[PDB]
Design a protein around this ligand. Structure first.
Ligand SMILES: NC(=O)c1ccc[n+]([C@@H]2O[C@H](COP(=O)([O-])OP(=O)(O)OC[C@H]3O[C@@H](n4cnc5c(N)ncnc54)[C@H](O)[C@@H]3O)[C@@H](O)[C@H]2O)c1
Ligand SMILES: NC(=O)c1ccc[n+]([C@@H]2O[C@H](COP(=O)([O-])OP(=O)(O)OC[C@H]3O[C@@H](n4cnc5c(N)ncnc54)[C@H](O)[C@@H]3O)[C@@H](O)[C@H]2O)c1
Ligand SMILES: NC(=O)c1ccc[n+]([C@@H]2O[C@H](COP(=O)([O-])OP(=O)(O)OC[C@H]3O[C@@H](n4cnc5c(N)ncnc54)[C@H](O)[C@@H]3O)[C@@H](O)[C@H]2O)c1
Ligand SMILES: NC(=O)c1ccc[n+]([C@@H]2O[C@H](COP(=O)([O-])OP(=O)(O)OC[C@H]3O[C@@H](n4cnc5c(N)ncnc54)[C@H](O)[C@@H]3O)[C@@H](O)[C@H]2O)c1
Ligand SMILES: [Zn+2]
Ligand SMILES: [Zn+2]
Ligand SMILES: [Zn+2]
Ligand SMILES: [Zn+2]
Lengths: 367, 367, 367, 367
C-alpha cells in the first residue's frame, strides 16, 4: 500500500542553544506558555525567561506536575486559556514533552519541544502516552502533527545524570531491530503505511551510531561535558530513533517493555532500561546470530543497561512473572504481532527466560 | 554552531494515491483551493474532486498560469481571498508547486504538495523560485516552513514522459556530492546550520539508490508502469534529494547549473539536465577519483543525461560561453563558495572545459 | 505452525541403470505393470523386460496414450485390474510419470518413476497434473505420497534432445527464487507447512549447481554423452528442484508460467521454457539486484531459454496479451500470492513488460 | 557407480504437534499399536490416547521394555497380531524407535516415528540396531524402507534433560566429517551407492547449524523451552544427520564409537557422547587443521560432551584399553576402512592417544 514518513518540521541541536531559544521560536508565535520540568526550572528558569525577553516574546512558565495525565493536561489547559498564548513550549523529560504535545493539540496551537535529556524517542513523535495520576498507563493519544520544532541543548543534556543518557541508548538501540522486523513482515507503521527507505536508513544509522559512539558518549556524559561523540548519540537517541520507530515500526522489544511494566519489581525502572531487555528478548525470538546478540549485550552492559532479569529487580517468582510479561506482550493490538510469523505467549516466555540466561552467562564470562 | 534538519511534516507515496487525497488532506482544512497545471488538471479534475467530496471537503480549482511570478501569485491571491479557503493544494510540476508554496505563505495557511512528476527536488523544500512573467529569474522566496504534506502518486508519475524522470535523476544525483562537499567545508546549509548525520545519510542513500535502481526505473518509466525500482527512484528524487539538498547543502554543481542558464543555447533543457553536467564539473573541480567520475558519467549517460557541452546544444564559441558560465557560477552569494578551499572563475572555467573533454572521451569509448 | 519436508523414499541415478531396474524394483512387488511412452518403449522394451525377468519378476507393458487424462487412467485402471499387479512403473516424460502416479493412487499400490528426460521437476513430486484428452488443463490431483522410487538413467537422458535438458534447467532455475520468496513471506508449501532448513538448502544448491554446471552439461547434452557435469544437472533438475519446489514453495514464476499457457502463441514451448521467463518476471516483481537478474538472464540465454516475449512467439498485441497473463497469474489460489506483500494484476503486468524490456536490452548488448 | 539418496516419506516438526498426531497418522491406517517409552508414557499416555480418539483412530499402547532386542520385538509381534493393527507408532528414544521400525518390518505395515528426544540420528534411518537383553550389540537389521512418517514435538524434546540434546549434538557433529571422508574416498554408503550432492549439502548444513545454533539451543534446552535455535538443532540432529549419514557415509568417528563401547568404563555413556570423542579421534586421523579441531573441541566442550578419555571414565590402564578400542574399530567390515587411504590399528591407537592429549590441553587452557 502507501509508504509514509513523518517528521517534525525543524530539528535543532547545539551547545547552549537555550540562549537562542527565543530567536528560534519567534516565527511560531508571540505569546508562549512553557511547561517545564521542576528540576530543570530549578537551575534554568531565569535563563529561559531571559531567552524569551531578548527576542521580544511574552512567556508564562508553568512548572510540571511530573506525570502526563489527563488531570495535569486539563490543569494546564485552563492556565493556557488565561494566558491567551499562541503556542506551547515543553522543556524537560519525555513526560514533560508528551504533556506539552497533548496540551497544544487540545489548544489548537503549534508546539516546540526542548528535551533536557536524551532519555527516550518521545521528542519527535506525533504521540502522547497518557497515564493515570498513579503512574499506570491510561491511553495513547495519537496526534495529527509532529512537533513544529525540536530544540536540543547538548550542554544541558550533558549536565544530567549519566544514567538518563544510557536509558536513551536503551530505547534507541531497539529502533533498528524493530523497524527491520516490520519491513521483513510488511507491518504497518504508526505513520499509517509501509516503510520507506529513508526511515530504514535512519533506523540502521541509529544502530551503527550507538555501536560506534555509545561508550565514548557515556564518558562525556559522566564528566558532564560535550564531545562530538555525545552530539551524535543525542541525535541518534532523538531524531534518528524517533523517525526510525514512528515511520519504521515497532515489534517485540517494546511489547516486552509493556509486559515488564506490569511486574511491580521493574515498574519504576526507566523506559529505555526496560526496552533494553526487550531488545535482547527479541534477538532470541528472531534467532539473531551469536555475534549480533553479543554485540548488543556488550554495548548494553558497557553503558549500564540491564541485561538480566535480576538487574530489573526480578529475582523471585521469575517463571510466574515472566508468564505475566509474555501474556501482556501478546495482547490484542500489541506490536509483537509485527514479528515475522508472529509470536505466541509460549514463544515470548521462552525468549524471556533464554535472554535472561544469556545475560547471566555474559556477566560471568566478564568477571 | 547549531546543526539543523528540516522536513515536510508528512511524505506519502503510493500508486493511485490521488484517490485518497481527501482522506489524507482532511486533518489540515475543510475548505481547499487547488492550484493546478492545465495539462494535469485536464486528466484528473474529476478524480481530484470526487476524492475531496467523498471525504466531505469543499474544493475550488484554479488553473495555473504556467510561470512562477508575483503577478501569478497575486491573481491566485485574489481567488483565494474570494474562495475563503483553509489551505492550498498544488498539483503539477515544480512551477505549480513553488507557486502553491508561495500562495500559502502570503495567505498564511497550510499547503499540500502533490507532484505529478519526479523531475526536481522542489516538492519538499522550504523555498520557491520566482520568475518574471517571461521566464527569467526574479528572486528567491525563502519560506519559513516546508510543506505540511507531500503526496506523490507513482502511477501518475509513471504516465509522465520518461525524459522527466531522467531529469529528476540528474537533479538527485548531485545531492550526495554537494552535501558531502559542504560537510568537508563546514559550510552552512539553507536550514541555517551545520550538517546533521541524518541529512548526510539521506543524501548518500540518494546516490546509492540512483546507482542501484536508476536504470531499472527508466525501463518502467519508458513502459509507463510502476515497479518497486521506479518506486524507489521517485523517493530518491523527491524526499531524499529534497531533504539532502536543503539540510545537507549545495555546492558547485548547482552554481554551474545557474551559470548555464545564462547561455541561451541551453535554455531548452530541463533543470536536472543542466545539473547533470554541473555534477561532472564539480567532480573535476574537487578532483574526484577516476572511478567516481566514471560511475557518475556512466549512470548519467545510461539514463539519457548530458555529459558534454554539445549535448546541452553548446557547440560554438565554447571558451567565450564557458567564461560567462564560470563568472556567473562564482557570483557573490553563489553556492560554489561552499567548496573546500573555494573556487575562482579560472578554476571553474578549467573544470568546465576538462569535464566536457571527459564526457567526450567517455562517449567515444562507449562505441 | 509445523515445518514439513516430503521426499521419495529412494532416488537412484546412474548410467545404464535401466539394466538394474528389476534388482532395484524387487523389494516393492513381484508383479509389475509398466506405463510407458511409445517412443521410449520402442527403444528399451527388450532392455526393460530382460531386467525384470533376470530379477524374477512378472511384467506387463501398457503403452501410454500421450496425455494425462482420467479417461487415460481409467483405460489403464482396467488393464491393471486385469494385470493383477502389485506396483506401477512409469517410464517416460512428465506426462507418463504423472499418469503412473495417478494410476498407482487409485489402485493403491506403490509406484516407481523412471524419468527418461530431465525436463521438469515432476518425477519426485506428490502431485499429478490432469488434462482433458485434448491438452487443456483439467484438475490438480494432490497425492498422499511421493513415489516410492525414482530411477534416472543418465545415459538415456543424454540421448534425449538437448532442448529438453535446457527445459529442465529453466524449470529448476526457478526453484531457489520461489522457495526463497516463500520463506521471506512465511507462506505454506504444498507439503502443508512452513519451510524447513533442508528444503531451502536443497533449493539453493539447485541454483548454484545450475550456475556452476549448466553450460558444461549442455555441451555433453549436445554430444549425447555423460559427464559428471551432466550428472549433477540431472540431479538438480530432478531431486533438488522436486523437493525444493514441493517443500520450499512456489511463487510468481510459476503463476506467470500458468498465465502464459492462456496465450495460444506460447503453446508450442515446453514447460520449463515458459517458467524461464516467469523467473525473470519474478525477479523484476521483487526488484532483485541488477547482478542477480543479469546472472539469471545470462544463464538462461547461455543454454537457449527464452528471455523475451518474442522468444515465446509473442510478438503482436503484447499489452493485451500481458493483461490476460497477469489476470490469470493473479487468480484466486495462485502461488503469486505467496510473494512478500502480495501482487496485484497491475504489478504483474508491469513486471511482464519490464522483464521483456530487460531481455531485449540483454540480447542487444550480447552482440 | 550408481548414486542413491534415501529419505523418510514425510518429516514433521513443530511445537505441541503431539496433539495433531492423530490427524497426521490417519492417512496411513485406522488401527494403531504404539510402542512407547515408559518415562514418556508416564506424562503423555493420556495425551497420545486423546490424539488418536479425536481423529477417529483405534489405538493400543504397549509400554516399551527398554532394549531393542529380538525378545522385545518378538513380544510386541504377538501383541500386534492380537491387536490386528495396520501400523506401528514408535514414541520415545532411539531404542524405542528402532524397536518400532523392526516391529513394523516383521509385521509388514507402515511405521510412524515420534522422537521424544533429539539424541541420535536413528529416527529417519532405514536401520534397526538389535541388542541382546544384556545390552550387548547383536546385529544390524537393514530395512527396505525408511519410516513413512517422522513427527517431532519440539516442546516434548525441550522438556527432556539437556544432556540428551547434547548427546544428539555429539552424534550429528560427526555427520559432515564422516560423509566428507567417504566422498573423498569413493566409499559406498548404506543407501547402496555413491554420495549425491544433496546428501553432502545436508551433511555440511548439519555441521554449520550446530556451529551456529548449538550453544543457543542448549540454553533453551536447559530452560526446557522452545526457541528457533532449538528448532534448528532438532532438525540438524534428526533429519539432516540421518540423511547425512545414511546417504552420505560413515567413517572413523563411528568405528571408534563401537570400540569405545567395548571398554566397560565407557559402555553406559550415551551413543552420541561416545561418538563425540570418535570425531576428535578422526580429526587427528585425517590431520584436520588446528582451527578445525579447536572449533569442534570448543563446541563439544561448550555443550558438555566428552573431549578427553577420562571424561568417559577411562582413567586407568589407558594404553591397554585404547589398544582394545583400536582393534575393534579396525575389524573387518568396520566403517574406518572408508577413511582415505584406510587406517591400521596402529594409526587409530595413535589417534586415540593424541586426541585425548589434545582434549587435556584444551581443558587446561580453559581453566
Ligand atoms: N510519545 C512517544 O513517542 C514516547 C516515546 C517514548 C517514551 N514516551 C514517554 O516518555 C516518558 C518517559 O520519559 P523520561 O524517561 O524522560 O521521564 P521523565 O520525563 O519523568 O524524566 C526523567 C527524570 O529526569 C529528570 N530530568 C529531566 N531533565 C533533567 C536534567 N536536565 N537534569 C537532571 N534531571 C533531569 C526529571 O526530573 C525526571 O525525574 C513516559 O511517559 C513514556 O511513556 C513517549
Ligand atoms: N524550490 C526548490 O527548491 C526548487 C528545486 C528545484 C527546482 N525548482 C524549480 O522547479 C521548476 C522546474 O520544474 P519542472 O522541471 O518540473 O518543470 P515544470 O513544472 O514546467 O513541469 C514540466 C512539464 O511537465 C508537465 N507535466 C507535469 N506532470 C505531468 C504528467 N503527469 N504527465 C505529463 N506531463 C506532466 C507539465 O505540464 C510541464 O509542461 C523551476 O522553476 C525550478 O527553479 C525549485
Ligand atoms: N506434478 C508436478 O509436480 C509437475 C511438475 C512439472 C511438470 N509437470 C507436468 O509434466 C508435463 C510436462 O512433461 P514434459 O515436459 O517432460 O513433456 P512430455 O512428457 O510430453 O515429454 C516430452 C517429449 O519427450 C519425449 N521423450 C522422453 N524421453 C525421451 C528420450 N529418452 N529420448 C527422446 N525423446 C524422449 C517424449 O516422447 C515426449 O514426446 C506437463 O503435464 C506438466 O504439467 C508436473
Ligand atoms: N538405527 C540407526 O540408524 C541408529 C542410529 C543411532 C543410534 N541408534 C540406536 O539408538 C539407541 C540409543 O538411543 P537413545 O540414546 O535415545 O537411548 P534410549 O532410547 O534408551 O533413550 C535414552 C533415555 O532417554 C529417556 N527419555 C526419552 N524420551 C524422554 C523424554 N521426553 N523426557 C525424558 N527422558 C526421556 C528414556 O527413558 C531413556 O532412558 C541405541 O540402541 C543405538 O544403537 C540407531
Ligand atoms: Zn521507546
Ligand atoms: Zn536542483
Ligand atoms: Zn515447473
Ligand atoms: Zn550415530
Amino acid at each position: 500500500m502507501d509508504r509514509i514518513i513523518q517528521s517534525p518540521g525543524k530539528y535543532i541541536q547545539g551547545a547552549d542553544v537555550i540562549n537562542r531559544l527565543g530567536e528560534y521560536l519567534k516565527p511560531l508565535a508571540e505569546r508562549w506558555l512553557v511547561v517545564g520540568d521542576k528540576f530543570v526550572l530549578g537551575f534554568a528558569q531565569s535563563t529561559v525567561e531571559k531567552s524569551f525577553k531578548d527576542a521580544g516574546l511574552v512567556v508564562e512558565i508553568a512548572p510540571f506536575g511530573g506525570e502526563c495525565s489527563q488531570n495535569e493536561i486539563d490543569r494546564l489547559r485552563g492556565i493556557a486559556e488565561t494566558a491567551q498564548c499562541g503556542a506551547i513550549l515543553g522543556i524537560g523529560g519525555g513526560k514533560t514533552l508528551d504533556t506539552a504535545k497533548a496540551l497544544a493539540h487540545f489548544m489548537g496551537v503549534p508546539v516546540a519541544i526542548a528535551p533536557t535529556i536524551a532519555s527516550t524517542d518521545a521528542p519527535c513523535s506525533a504521540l502522547s502516552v497518557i497515564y493515570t495520576d498513579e503512574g499506570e498507563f491510561d491511553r495513547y493519544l495519537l496526534l495529527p502533527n509532529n512537533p513544529n520544532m525540536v530544540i536540543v541543548d547538548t550542554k544541558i543534556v550533558a549536565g544530567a545524570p549519566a544514567r538518563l543518557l544510557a536509558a536513551g541508548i536503551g530505547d534507541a538501540l531497539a529502533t533498528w531491530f524493530e523497524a527491520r522486523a516490520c519491513s521483513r513482515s510488511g507491518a504497518t507503521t504508526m505513520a499509517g503505511g509501509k516503510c520507506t527507505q529513508a526511515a530504514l536508513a535512519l533506523a540502521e544509522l541509529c544502530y551503527n551510531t550507538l555501536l560506534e559512539e555509545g561508550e565514548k558518549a557515556m564518558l562525556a556524559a559522566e564528566q558532564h561535558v560535550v564531545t562530538p561523540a555525545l552530539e551524535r548519540v543525542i541525535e541518534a537517541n532523538t531524531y534518528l530513533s524517533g523517525v526510525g520507530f514512528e515511520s519504521g515500526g515497532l515489534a517485540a522489544a517494546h511489547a516486552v517493555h509493556n509486559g515488564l511494566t506490569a511486574i511491580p519489581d521493574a515498574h519504576h525502572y526507566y523506559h529505555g532500561e526496560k526496552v533494553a531487555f526487550g531488545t535482547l528478548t527479541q534477538l532470541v525470538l528472531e534467532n539473531a546470530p551469536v555475534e549480533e546478540i553479543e554485540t548488543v549485550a556488550a554495548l548494553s552492559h558497557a553503558v549500564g543497561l540491564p541485561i538480566t532479569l535480576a538487574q530489573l529487580d526480578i529475582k523471585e517468582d521469575v517463571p510466574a512473572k515472566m508468564r505475566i510479561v509474555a501474556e501482556a506482550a501478546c495482547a490484542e493490538g500489541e506490536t509483537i504481532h509485527n514479528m515475522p510469523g508472529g509470536a505466541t505467549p509460549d514463544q515470548v516466555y521462552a525468549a524471556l527466560l533464554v535472554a535472561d540466561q544469556y545475560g547471566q552467562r555474559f556477566l560471568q564470562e566478564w568477571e
